[PDB]
Write a protein that binds this DNA or RNA. Structure first.
Length: 165
DNA sequence: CGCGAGTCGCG
């Protein structure tokens, strides 16, 4: 089971689909080394160095948080049904209303569409909001995605650059 | 007409 890393006053709360099998085993988000998450948020500008998975609690220091749509561990995101995703979206919303981050970043177009029941969503900022929290759809950092690191970083940086101050 | 919903190949 991977614990949520949330708090009030965060700039961004990163939300993945569900934990992979090693993250599930280690108790840290995006724990598998094949996963680009830590490198991407570092290069995108959210952290000053590439944090190791086990340093995850320190994301709060950079006013960043991490959660997931579906708790149930699974090897591939596609093993998660639309029903679970939709159920997750409902709970995610409560978490957002609770902590009220400046932005919620959903990692995966399909994940966003399923969890929020949206059609033909485009990458980037959405018009949809949760109170004062704006919503973005960023490429999932999995090594299974064919989206390159360069593309991953750019997508994430665009988000960083938009949250001023 | 409209809508809602039923894998493959790509590094």
């Amino acid at each position: 089971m991977v614990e949520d890393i949330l708090a009030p006053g965060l700039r961004v709360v990163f939300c993945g689909i569900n934990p992979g099998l090693s993250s599930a085993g280690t108790g840290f988000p995006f724990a598998h080394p094949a996963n680009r998450f830590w490198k991407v948020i570092y290069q995108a500008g959210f952290t000053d160095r590439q944090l190791k998975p086990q340093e995850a609690q320190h994301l709060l220091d950079y006013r960043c948080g991490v959660t997931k749509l579906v708790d149930r561990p699974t090897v591939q995101a596609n093993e998660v049904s639309k029903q679970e995703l939709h159920a997750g979206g409902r709970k995610l919303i409560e978490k957002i209303e609770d902590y009220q981050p400046q932005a919620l970043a959903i990692l995966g177009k399909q994940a966003y569409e399923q969890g929020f029941s949206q059609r033909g969503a485009q990458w980037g900022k959405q018009t949809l909001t949760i109170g004062s929290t704006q919503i973005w759809v960023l490429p999932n950092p999995s090594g299974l995605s064919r989206v390159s690191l360069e593309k991953l970083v750019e997508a994430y940086r665009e988000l960083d650059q938009a949250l001023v101050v």
